[PDB]
Design a protein around this nucleic acid. Structure first.
Ligand SMILES: [Zn+2]
Ligand SMILES: [Zn+2]
Ligand SMILES: [Zn+2]
Ligand SMILES: [Zn+2]
Ligand SMILES: [Zn+2]
Ligand SMILES: [Zn+2]
Ligand SMILES: [Zn+2]
Length: 171
DNA sequence: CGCCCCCTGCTGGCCTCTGTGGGCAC
DNA sequence: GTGCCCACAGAGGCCAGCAGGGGGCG
C-alpha cells in the first residue's frame, strides 16, 4: 500500500517525497521564490510553469490550427472544444441549460442557483425571490400571461379574435 | 529528487443572443 | 387600440490565462 501516511489528514503515498508536498500544502511552505515577481511556489514545476508568464514561452501548439498555449491543459481543452465532435457536455442539475466546461458549470451554479440572503422583488409584481434563476424564470413568465400560444408557427397574440383569425391563415 | 502530465477551479474579457421599449400602420 | 421594426442595454456561456493538489517515471 502507501506507507508514508499524513498526520494532519488522510493522505498517503508510496513515496516520501510526495508526502513532503502534501505536508507542504498544510503548512503553506513555498521553498521556490520567483526571481521576477513576488510569487512563491510549493513545487519546482509550478515555478517553471510560472516563468512562462514572464518569458512568454508557449511550448504547446494545437496541431490543427497551430495556436500556442502556456499550459498543456489549455491546449487540450482548446482542441476538445474547437476541433472535436461528439464531446460530452455538462447538464445543470437544477435547470435545463447545457454547459461545455465543468468550471463554467460552477460559475453557473454560483450565479444562478446560490441562495441570496437579500431577496429581490420582481419588476412586474410583488413576488420576492432569493435565487436568481427562479427570479428570472418568474419575470419571463409574465410575458406568457394574456398571450395566446402557437400550434405550428411561432406567432404570439393577445386577442382571441386575432388569434382565431390567424389560425385561418393556415387553412 | 525533478520533470511532465493530469484534473481542478477561479478570473475577467470576449461572442453572441435576448427582450424590451419607442416609433409607425388597419 | 394592437401588431411589426430596430436600436441597445443586459446577460451568460465561451474561452484562454493562471495557480491549486497529486500520480507516474526517469
Ligand atoms: Zn495532510
Ligand atoms: Zn514571477
Ligand atoms: Zn486549434
Ligand atoms: Zn442551472
Ligand atoms: Zn457561500
Ligand atoms: Zn412577478
Ligand atoms: Zn400561425
Amino acid at each position: 500500500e502507501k506507507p508514508f501516511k499524513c498526520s494532519m489528514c488522510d493522505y498517503a503515498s508510496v513515496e516520501v517525497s510526495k508526502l513532503k508536498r502534501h505536508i507542504r500544502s498544510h503548512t503553506g511552505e513555498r521553498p521556490f521564490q520567483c526571481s521576477l515577481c513576488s510569487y512563491a511556489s510549493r513545487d519546482t514545476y509550478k515555478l517553471k510553469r510560472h516563468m512562462r508568464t514572464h518569458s512568454g514561452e508557449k511550448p504547446y501548439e494545437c496541431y490543427i490550427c497551430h495556436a500556442r498555449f502556456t499550459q498543456s491543459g489549455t491546449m487540450k481543452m482548446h482542441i476538445l472544444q474547437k476541433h472535436t465532435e461528439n464531446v460530452a457536455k455538462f447538464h445543470c442539475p437544477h435547470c435545463d441549460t447545457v454547459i461545455a466546461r465543468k468550471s463554467d458549470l460552477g460559475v453557473h451554479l454560483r450565479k444562478q442557483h446560490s441562495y441570496i440572503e437579500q431577496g429581490k422583488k420582481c419588476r412586474y409584481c410583488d413576488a420576492v425571490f432569493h435565487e436568481r434563476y427562479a427570479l428570472i424564470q418568474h419575470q419571463k413568465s409574465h410575458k406568457n400571461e394574456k398571450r395566446f400560444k402557437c400550434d405550428q408557427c411561432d406567432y404570439a397574440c393577445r386577442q382571441e379574435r386575432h388569434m382565431i383569425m390567424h389560425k385561418r391563415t393556415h387553412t
